[PDB]
């Protein structure tokens, strides 16, 4: 806790505003208040006279829609000196330094004699407010010129909290009174005096616009405008009582900003509605109560950390929208009522003001998730969560924050279509003042109902919405809008539910003799798409059935049909970004491949079923030693193979899956390593012998393994299942492990580092391999999208020629971090969302100084405890102490199975590791500069090849895409198994052998999967090389040089660049075609 507290202090002083600017601004607006007092008074005038007064003036009255017409504006207008006040965070001295800048809220109270008791009806008060503001801007402008301040002051109108009914004047300073360096903007808010209108008449249930429907939005704007100083007095008292109020407030402000929350209006579409004020008011309401028993949830003696935690805990658990609402008295203990108004409500009995009227239901649900999510990180003790909670912005990219994004292009967008605009109608104008408010809800309700359980949270964003307009204009002017609609296009952002996002059928109300209300709306909503169907269990329900595709999810089809039917038949819905990612995943050559969802693992299970058939055969055989267990450790057994298994597709590199066969413990095992390996082969011979005789339908052949260095006697039995699958069997013996340790002990001191590397590979294949496949398989079922994203990530690596050096297991462990450690984001729910999160993590991962350690556990045991967590941390510091620059080891990936952390990340050359992060940094930079679009994705998946010193082009004799099981194909194995090599790609083996010979001089890379990244025919592969800087220049001739070089002098030799190509060329034989240097 002490570490957290000191972190809090460091954060607070970092964001603390510099006191010099406070005097600088305080010098200015103090002089500003003199100018306002200079403004003269004014006489009664009707709309006709004020229009003539402002007819020629540069200023224009910002009348609120509907603009006052002569017939209904019989009431007159007047102006008098305001009762000036300062409010906001600045008044409470709770502001922080913001690079984008802050705002100083100056309130001008309209004198009460200017109003009538019934001026809160039919926008009477608002229209009086508009002229009162316009008159101020007129006289303020000339006085600003008089004092010569106009040179560096820019004036413009804007909406308070993006509220269309409350235009305000914004004063900003461009580059003695110049406060540009302060980064502040003075806002002039024209409020009403307290208690001018009977607040009971202004309750959310009541109405104030005659047309009866309630007007929560209009009632709030007038009522909140009349209650500004009262809340300042409320907050001032609480600040004195508890000494840590301001520190807690800034913590909430910082937390809200990172999640992209603001006090601005949410009915228009933008995410917000809790700002610092709502966080501050809610904390005050909790300090004087909050419990159902009206007991205090926060104590004035609480510290900053405690105060922040309570409000976060309050939001996370107790519901303020559907079931329950919180009432308090600003001017009386705050009590939580169980009843709910079906909208976010934080009622104030003293003021009769609901502080969360600006909030939409959809945005409220997202915060409750965010508040709940942080409450979990806040309770976390093993890992520090300060940076994730406060020092990480998740709103920078909508794709990373939202699983799916659909942009809907509305028709006729210099006004919305007559049919579309006609839907707005007079009735919804009363409920929803602006069309943008109306349309945002219309999209949300139909989209929410249509998708139903398929989604968790939905956000509707009106892209390109402005809130400030020049003084010469009355309303915001959008280029597409034409003063009609303040938006270019609307975007639908979704948080899908992986469990049910891909259900083929949308279940509905059950059948009944009389159609129920729920059944009626279901049939009306879906129209022809609705149908009544029966199932195996015998239930008769109204349901509609869709069709799965391998290019797009079901949700894309539903929203398109749902929005078009109800919103507008001309709407254009398009999410191409998800479509491109889906296509980049290889398409298997199975029946009905195109119609399979990307979440379907039926191909993998078919491989397992074939393995089970072989699994039974092996045990029932009789051998000298009984079979202890058969453990499959192949890629396809953990749903990670890049291309799904396809029967008889033996050209795929991942065709032959490794299986660990273990016998009973015996004391007769050979004590010599080569004898032990040949003892294992002898058992495999008998397994092949009995398998060949008893089950002739299985075919088998023997292949050698050299992955473990210096153990050249390993022989693995390859079994070709009749179903069309291949399995590779290797024998594990208990004596095998201790024999390697014996080698290390007996090895000379200088060779011991070499031998342990050999042991490191053996454990990665035999011992650690079993654990990794076990944990990853079980976890993958909870993380549905893990299998596609990791496959696509491996596809991304291969295009850039990195899989040749990055072992597979390292690739999964990096790709699973967004799932096991989703903070500060959510668990990925889409292929697009998941893949980009992996790139984001690598981009910001400083592997030199920060280790990566994972809790491979299902969503909230085997979670790392504090002792284990510190133990792995101590391992990293020991390694970095010996390897500070990180030359020997780059990526430290550890978990319960691998506490050492060097098991799956050893042997990677430094240029490759930097290249991986270098590509990630460019990818994120590319996305920031250019938004996610078709061109950007193609650039992501296209490899440069220009950085490499020399590039070698290879072509296979025959296209391998068909035999790899990739649908742009063999149906039986060759009669002579020697013919298998004829349909294999050997360039991967060439690179491996070339790397060993030229380890000291060259680093060669190639595309492991040629069928996917080898063109249309899958026959083109490329070998790229890198000359180390040392041997790039000339060197003195020495015996220990260890490189192919050409002399220039008696003792000067240079890298024999041309000869190495002759070496590389002749391996290819017919394969190599062209060279680039």
């Amino acid at each position: 806790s002490n570490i957290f507290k000191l972190q809090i202090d460091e954060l607070l002083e970092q964001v603390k505003l510099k006191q010099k600017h406070v005097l600088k601004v305080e010098k200015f607006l103090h002089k500003l208040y003199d100018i306002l007092q200079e403004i003269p008074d004014w006489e009664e005038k009707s709309l006709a006279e004020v229009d003539s007064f402002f007819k020629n003036k540069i200023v224009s009255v910002p009348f609120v829609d509907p603009k006052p017409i002569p017939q209904n504006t019989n009431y007159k207008f007047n102006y008098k000196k305001p009762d000036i006040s300062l409010i906001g965070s600045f008044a409470l001295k709770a502001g922080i330094y913001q690079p984008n800048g802050s705002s100083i809220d100056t309130l001008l109270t309209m004198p009460k004699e200017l109003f009538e008791k019934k001026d809160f009806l039919n926008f009477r008060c608002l229209h009086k407010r508009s002229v009162y503001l316009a008159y101020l801007t007129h006289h303020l402008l000339i006085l600003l010129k008089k004092d010569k301040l106009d040179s560096f002051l820019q004036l413009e109108y804007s909406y308070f909290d993006n509220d269309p009914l409350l235009p305000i004047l914004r004063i900003s300073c461009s580059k003695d009174y110049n406060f540009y360096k302060t980064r502040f903007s003075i806002n002039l808010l024209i409020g009403f005096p307290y208690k001018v209108f009977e607040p009971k008449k202004l309750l959310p249930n009541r109405n104030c616009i005659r047309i009866l429907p309630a007007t929560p939005l209009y009632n709030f704007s007038v009522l909140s405008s009349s209650t500004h100083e009262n809340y300042l007095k409320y907050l001032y008292k609480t600040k004195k009582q508890t000494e840590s109020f301001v520190e807690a407030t800034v913590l909430g402000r910082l937390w809200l900003q990172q999640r992209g929350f603001s006090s601005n209006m949410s009915h228009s579409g933008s995410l917000g509605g809790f700002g610092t004020f709502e966080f501050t008011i809610l904390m005050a309401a909790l300090l004087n109560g909050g419990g159902i028993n009206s007991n205090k949830i926060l104590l004035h003696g609480f510290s900053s950390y405690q105060l922040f935690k309570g409000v976060i805990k309050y939001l996370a658990t107790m519901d303020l929208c559907h079931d329950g609402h919180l009432q308090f008295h600003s001017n009386p203990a705050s009590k939580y009522i169980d009843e709910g108004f079906q909208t976010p409500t934080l009622f104030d009995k003293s003021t009769k003001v609901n502080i969360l009227t600006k909030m939409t239901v959809s945005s409220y649900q997202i915060l409750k998730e965010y508040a709940g999510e942080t409450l979990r990180m806040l309770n976390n003790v093993v890992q520090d969560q300060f940076s994730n909670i406060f020092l990480t912005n998740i709103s920078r990219f909508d794709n990373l924050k939202y699983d799916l994004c659909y942009d809907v292009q509305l028709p006729l967008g210099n006004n919305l279509e007559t049919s579309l605009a006609a839907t707005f109608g007079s009735m919804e104008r009363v409920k929803f003042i602006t069309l943008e408010n109306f349309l945002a809800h219309k999209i949300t309700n139909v989209a929410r109902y249509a998708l139903g359980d398929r989604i968790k949270y939905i956000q509707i964003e009106m892209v390109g919405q402005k809130s400030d307009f020049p003084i010469t204009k009355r309303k915001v002017y959008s280029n597409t809008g034409g003063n009609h609609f303040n938006f270019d296009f609307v975007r639908v952002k979704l948080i899908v539910n992986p469990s049910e996002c891909d259900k083929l059928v949308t279940k509905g109300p059950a059948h009944s003799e009389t159609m129920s209300t729920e059944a009626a709306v279901f049939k009306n909503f879906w129209g022809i798409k609705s149908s009544l169907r029966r199932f195996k269990d015998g239930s008769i329900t109204h349901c509609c059935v869709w069709s799965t595709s391998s290019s797009e999810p079901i949700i894309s089809s539903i929203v398109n049909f749902a929005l078009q039917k109800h919103v507008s038949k001309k709407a254009q819905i398009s999410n191409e970004t998800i479509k491109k990612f889906h296509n980049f995943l290889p398409l298997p050559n199975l029946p009905s491949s195109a119609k399979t969802s990307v979440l379907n693992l039926s191909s993998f299970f078919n491989l397992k079923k074939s393995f089970d058939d072989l699994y039974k055969i092996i045990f029932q055989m009789k051998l000298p030693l009984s079979v202890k267990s058969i453990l499959p450790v192949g890629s396809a057994f953990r749903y990670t193979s890049l291309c799904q298994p396809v029967p008889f597709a033996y050209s795929d590199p991942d065709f032959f899956q490794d299986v660990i066969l273990e016998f009973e413990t015996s004391p007769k095992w050979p004590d010599e390593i080569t004898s032990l390996e040949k003892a294992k082969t002898a058992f495999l011979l008998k397994i092949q012998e009995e398998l060949s005789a008893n089950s002739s339908t299985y075919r088998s052949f023997f292949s050698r393994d050299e992955s473990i260095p210096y153990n050249l006697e390993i022989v693995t039995l390859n079994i070709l299942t009749p179903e069309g699958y291949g399995f590779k069997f290797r024998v594990l013996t208990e004596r095998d492990e201790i024999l390697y340790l014996r080698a290390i002990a007996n090895a000379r001191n200088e060779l011991k580092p070499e031998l342990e590397a050999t042991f490191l590979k053996f454990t990665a294949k035999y011992l650690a391999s079993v654990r990794h496949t076990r944990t990853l398989e079980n976890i993958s079922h909870s993380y549905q999208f893990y299998s596609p994203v990791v496959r696509l990530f491996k596809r991304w690596l291969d295009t850039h020629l990195l899989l040749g050096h990055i072992t597979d297991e390292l690739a999964e462990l990096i790709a699973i971090k967004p799932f096991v450690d989703p903070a500060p984001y959510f668990i990925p729910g889409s292929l697009e969302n998941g893949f980009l999160k992996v790139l984001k993590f690598i981009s910001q991962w400083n592997w030199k100084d920060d280790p990566l350690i994972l809790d491979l556990v299902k969503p909230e045991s085997e979670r790392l405890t504090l002792a284990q967590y510190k133990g792995i941390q101590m391992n990293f510091t020991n390694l970095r102490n010996s390897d500070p620059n990180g030359t020997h080891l780059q990526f430290f990936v550890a978990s319960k199975n691998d506490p050492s952390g060097i098991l799956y990340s050893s042997g990677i050359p430094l240029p490759i590791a930097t290249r991986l992060t270098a590509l990630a940094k460019v990818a994120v930079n590319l996305l920031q500069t250019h938004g996610l679009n078709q061109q950007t994705i193609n650039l992501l998946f296209t490899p440069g090849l220009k950085d490499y010193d020399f590039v070698v082009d290879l072509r296979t004799p025959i296209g391998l895409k068909s035999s790899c099981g990739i649908l742009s194909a063999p149906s039986n194995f060759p009669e002579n198994l020697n013919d298998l090599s004829e349909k294999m790609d050997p360039t991967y083996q060439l690179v491996k052998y070339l790397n060993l010979k030229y380890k000291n001089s060259l680093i060669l890379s190639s595309r492991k999967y040629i069928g996917v990244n080898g063109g249309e025919k899958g026959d083109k592969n490329v070998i790229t090389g890198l000359i180390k800087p040392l041997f790039k220049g000339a060197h003195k001739f020495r015996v220990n040089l260890d490189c192919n070089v050409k002399p220039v002098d008696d003792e000067n030799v240079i890298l024999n660049k041309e000869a190495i190509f002759h070496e590389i060329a002749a391996f290819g034989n017919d394969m190599v075609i062209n060279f680039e240097t």
């Binding site: 850039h800 400083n846 990180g886 930097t914 270098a918 940094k921 460019v922 990818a923 440069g944």
Partner: peptide, 13 residues
């Protein structure tokens, strides 16, 4: 295309 100069000093970090 997605091109990044090759770094051998880990300077990108």
């Amino acid at each position: 295309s997605l091109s990044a100069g090759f770094d051998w000093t880990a300077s990108i970090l």
